[PDB]
Design a protein around this ligand. Structure first.
Ligand SMILES: [Cl-]
Length: 251
């Protein structure tokens, strides 16, 4: 039961947060000192019953408070969950109400604890890269199949120096929600700033959204000195912030 050192509620919030029944956000972090490979923010509009997913690029060039501009991924390295939460709140200028961190092991247990997740594979390029990544232990086929954790894991790690990987992560995560609604878990290696009891209460809601939507931060390669960063498009960032603050109903 993690507790951000930032207190009872996000410092980004002006009014008092209802535990509770009003709009909120969740940061998912997957690791695998150390760096986060999965970086997905979800905002949940209560009144609308809608959700918005955003993957923060591993290499996004952002200010890490107390550390200067750097790759987004290093935040969790320099300061763990709390530093990363700060970085996201500073960068997106929204409250991050909940965070859940996990290694990809816990991830794999979840998937076939659910008896696999539905995923429609479409690309031979992808089938091949996984084939090679895994030295043939994992071999996907085209079309709609139910993957087990090993297969889902491999799908979610595959990577050509940027992200589309984030797109695969959001794809499987929404698949997990879907597969979960047709029935702790646990629920074991998840570290959250949430109690399981509280978590359980959010499930009904999370599990009956009227729609899910992905958003995307666009940008460009910035390689000052053979060090790779993804420079964010500032106009797109501002738009995204404005859309996020709305869902949350802040500002
Ligand atoms: Cl695919």
């Amino acid at each position: 039961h993690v507790s951000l050192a930032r207190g009872e509620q996000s410092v980004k919030r002006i009014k008092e947060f209802d535990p509770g029944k009003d709009s909120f956000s969740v940061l998912l972090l997957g690791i695998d000192q150390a760096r986060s490979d999965a970086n997905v923010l979800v905002t949940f509009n209560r009144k609308e019953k809608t959700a918005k997913m955003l993957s923060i690029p591993r290499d996004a060039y952002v200010n890490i408070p107390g550390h200067g501009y750097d790759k987004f991924t290093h935040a969790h390295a320099y300061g763990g969950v709390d530093l990363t939460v700060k970085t996201v709140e500073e960068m997106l200028d929204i409250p991050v109400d909940y965070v859940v961190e996990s290694n990809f092991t816990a991830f794999e247990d979840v998937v076939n604890e659910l008896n696999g997740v539905k995923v429609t594979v479409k690309s031979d390029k992808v089938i091949q890269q996984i084939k090679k990544d895994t030295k043939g232990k994992v071999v996907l086929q085209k079309g709609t199949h139910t993957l087990d954790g090993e297969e889902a894991l491999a799908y979610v790690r595959t990577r050509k120096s940027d992200l589309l990987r984030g797109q695969r992560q959001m794809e499987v995560l929404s698949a997990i929600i879907d597969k979960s609604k047709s029935l702790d878990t646990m629920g074991q290696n998840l570290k959250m700033n949430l109690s399981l009891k509280d978590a359980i209460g959010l499930f009904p809601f999370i599990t009956s959204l009227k729609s899910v939507e992905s958003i995307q931060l666009t940008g460009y390669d910035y390689e000052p000195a053979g060090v790779y960063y993804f420079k964010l498009n500032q106009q797109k960032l501002q738009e995204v912030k404005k859309e996020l603050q709305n869902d949350l109903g802040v500002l």
